Design a protein around this ligand. Structure first.
Ligand code: MG
Ligand code: MG
Length: 211
């Protein structure tokens, strides 16, 4: 039973209600493979491509941790999603926007070269789930002082191979280092590369692999 409605206990009803209003009925392969285990709290290494429905795969358990632990603007940041490009960062964010329609928790797109000071003032408020792009996020983490990440629960790395290709290998190593180690970490990459396997060691602990 790969339907979405059988994910009620495991995932908040307000999440399923939104997803039902998105027009989805049944889970894709990676969703079925990934969600159940990710809810339990395992670190995933996924060999996924765009079109697999991987976005929802990582978003459902991400929003779940934020709702479960009842995060507030007070609590700083909870989930951190990394995207190579602005196109994908925005893409993922639009989905997040749809999924958060029946939630009160704070979410924002702290990505791309676009008005740095307005983002800083925004993050100061307390943004629970953040869809971001690496190079700019590190800039906030090193320079924006009122940015709280100490409470981080989930870290998602979308299109890992594509992140390295745009030249963010060092930007990655430096965000991960500065992140609290007690966390769930998810790694999605279409192409299994030598470099990809290396930052997987840095990011993950003992992953359930999914192809
Ligand atoms: Mg660079
Ligand atoms: Mg991928």
């Amino acid at each position: 039973t790969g339907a979405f409605e059988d994910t009620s206990f495991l995932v908040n009803e307000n999440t399923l209600k939104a997803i039902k209003e998105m027009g989805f009925t049944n889970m894709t392969e990676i969703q079925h493979k990934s969600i159940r285990p990710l809810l339990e709290g395992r670190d995933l290494l996924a060999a996924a491509k765009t079109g697999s429905g991987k976005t929802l795969a990582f978003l459902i358990p991400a929003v779940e941790l934020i709702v479960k632990l009842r995060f507030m603007p007070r609590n700083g940041t909870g989930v951190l999603i990394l995207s190579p490009t602005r196109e994908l960062a925005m893409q993922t964010f639009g989905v997040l926007k749809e999924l958060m329609t029946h939630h009160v928790h704070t979410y924002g797109l702290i990505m791309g070269g676009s008005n740095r000071s307005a983002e800083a003032q925004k993050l100061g408020n307390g943004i629970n789930i953040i869809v971001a792009t690496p190079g700019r996020l590190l800039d906030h983490m090193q320079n924006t002082p009122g940015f709280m990440y100490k409470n981080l629960q989930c870290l998602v790395i979308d299109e890992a191979d594509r992140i390295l290709d745009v030249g963010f290998e060092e930007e990655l190593k430096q965000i991960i280092k500065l992140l609290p180690t007690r966390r769930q970490t998810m790694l999605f990459s279409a192409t299994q590369t030598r470099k990809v396997e290396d930052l997987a060691r840095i990011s993950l602990k003992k992953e359930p692999l999914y192809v």
